[PDB]
């Protein structure tokens, strides 16, 4: 009856692995886990992005209305006296507003200066895409902004995480001049646009009409659809190439399964050249003046 | 419907296999290399007389090296630091 402690004890680990596999654990705040120092985290956060924050402003930035409302719920239901020092908490509202306004201003200036030929609606949509719930949620998640945020409901729903993220931006705008925040935004946001196409984030469903409009605005007369190469018309798998001609010159050309889809594609290409978003365009500048 | 009695390449009846143009190329290339070889192998710098003992000085010393190399073999010095160094296992942090 002299057993392996090594055996039973080692098997305990397996038993635990199986428990964790059949019932997945609900995600828990890193703040509730064994190793946490919130001040150290805050200081480190700024140190690793090479930014100078008054720690006061950054602490202000991660505070959410939800955390305060829950804190007040607990202060009321336990009979604990909190109110004054808890109202001194100063939520991230102001900072978040400063943040979004300056952020959209900043991006809009970037695209305006980079791609002169984009229409108002274009820079509008691009900015709208970099500031989109999804993208900001993603970037915020990977910078450990979700971990350092104080709010109720630990999965930290997207509309919260966004506020939280821009709060950091506004907080940078206070501590550092617009010149520094420029570099930060262009580093952790504009980069999300790498690899993605124009009409991927435009969603405009009328390529033809918009092409005609832009050509009218350019004093260019008559876009003309003409069929260049086609392989198989009788096959379940035909292939077409429509060129678009403005006064005998070929402005763009595209592939498709039908004549319609091909027309759409040539339209996309033309639009891309005119507006200036193309595979050949210079990669985005990075230099630090 | 055609067999090659016994084993393919061994016995008194074999598989007929023919020589090819490739093989001729290779053989001739290798010959040409050998011809050029013995041209350069033909003409010594020193004569046989002239080369006598021309390094007997170095070839003695090489062998002295080979000897010393073995002469040097003995069980290595054992030092205090290792035996007492072993005591470091129980080091206590208090």
């Amino acid at each position: 009856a002299k057993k392996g402690f090594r055996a039973a004890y080692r098997f305990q680990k397996e038993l635990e692995r199986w428990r964790l596999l059949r019932c997945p654990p609900p995600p828990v705040r890193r703040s509730e886990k064994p190793n946490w120092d919130y001040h150290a985290e805050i200081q480190a956060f700024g140190h690793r992005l090479q930014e100078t924050f008054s720690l006061d402003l950054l602490k202000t930035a991660f505070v959410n209305s939800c955390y305060i409302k829950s804190e007040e719920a607990k202060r009321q239901k336990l009979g604990i006296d909190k109110e004054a020092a808890l109202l001194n908490l100063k939520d991230n509202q102001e900072l978040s507003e400063q943040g979004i306004s300056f952020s959209q201003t900043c991006l809009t200036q970037f695209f305006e200066d980079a791609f002169p030929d984009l229409p108002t609606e274009g820079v509008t949509s691009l900015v709208d895409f970099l500031t989109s719930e999804e993208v900001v949620c993603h970037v915020a998640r990977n910078l450990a902004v979700e971990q350092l945020a104080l709010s109720a409901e630990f999965p930290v729903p997207p509309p919260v995480l966004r506020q939280t993220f821009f709060a950091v931006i506004g907080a940078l705008l206070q501590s550092s001049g617009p010149e520094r925040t420029a570099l930060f935004i262009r580093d952790f946001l504009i980069t999300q646009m790498t690899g993605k196409e124009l009409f991927e984030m435009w969603t405009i469903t009328n390529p033809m009409g918009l092409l005609v409009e832009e050509l009218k605005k350019r004093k260019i007369s008559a876009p003309e659809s003409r069929l260049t190469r086609q392989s198989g018309s009788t096959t379940a798998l035909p292939v077409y190439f429509v060129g678009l001609y403005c006064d005998r010159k070929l402005i763009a050309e595209g592939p498709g399964e039908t004549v319609l889809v091909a027309e759409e594609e040539a339209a996309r290409v033309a639009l891309r050249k005119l507006f200036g978003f193309t595979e050949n365009r210079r990669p985005w500048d990075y230099s630090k003046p | 419907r055609n067999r090659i009695p016994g084993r393919q390449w061994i016995g008194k009846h074999r598989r007929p296999r023919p020589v090819s143009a490739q093989a001729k190329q290779n053989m001739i290339r290798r010959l040409e290399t050998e011809a050029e070889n013995q041209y350069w192998l033909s003409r010594p710098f020193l004569t046989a007389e002239q080369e006598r003992g021309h390094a007997a000085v170095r070839r003695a010393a090489a062998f002295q090296a080979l000897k010393a190399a073995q002469a040097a073999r003995f069980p290595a010095h054992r030092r205090l630091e290792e035996q007492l160094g072993h005591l470091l296992v129980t080091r206590k942090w208090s």
Binding site: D37, H47, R48, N142, T191, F241 | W93
Partner: protein, 148 residues
């Protein structure tokens, strides 16, 4: 075996290294034992190295717990959300230092067979081959046998 595991394409987290390099290791937590022998190496690394390592890497937080524990471990945690476990158990100080320095500079992306050595976007600059690309055009786009 490569058919046994999963795979990933070459990747950076959050397009790291483009705008700036962001060191991906976030927290590093040691657990040693003041009394027990297996932690010997882990002890010295805490005395001599941890200071200079912390000075060198301002970004990573380093938690250090002496506790009544028999197998000294270091738990790396990543900006990625990835967690990696190590035993520093029964190792020299140069060996602990080396290991920690390996942890420091990894991405936290899983170590799994990477399919091809390079990740390209817009690989295709100036064009990408399609069967029609090199064929000559004819007059009026007539077929091989057609008459117009």
């Amino acid at each position: 075996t490569a058919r046994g595991t999963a795979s990933r394409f070459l990747t950076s987290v959050l397009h790291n290294g483009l705008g700036r390099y962001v060191q991906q290791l976030q927290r590093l937590s040691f657990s040693l034992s003041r009394d027990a022998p297996s932690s010997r190496g882990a002890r010295e690394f805490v005395e001599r190295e941890v200071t200079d390592f912390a000075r060198r890497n301002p970004g990573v937080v380093i938690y250090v717990n002496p506790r009544p524990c028999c197998v000294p471990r270091v738990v790396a945690e990543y900006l990625n959300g990835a967690v990696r476990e190590e035993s520093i158990h029964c190792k020299s100080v140069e060996e602990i230092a080396a290991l920690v320095q390996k942890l420091a500079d990894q991405s936290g992306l899983d170590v799994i067979r990477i399919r091809k050595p390079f990740h390209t976007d817009s690989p295709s600059i100036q064009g990408q081959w399609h069967p029609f690309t090199n064929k000559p055009t004819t007059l009026g786009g007539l077929r091989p046998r057609e008459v117009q």
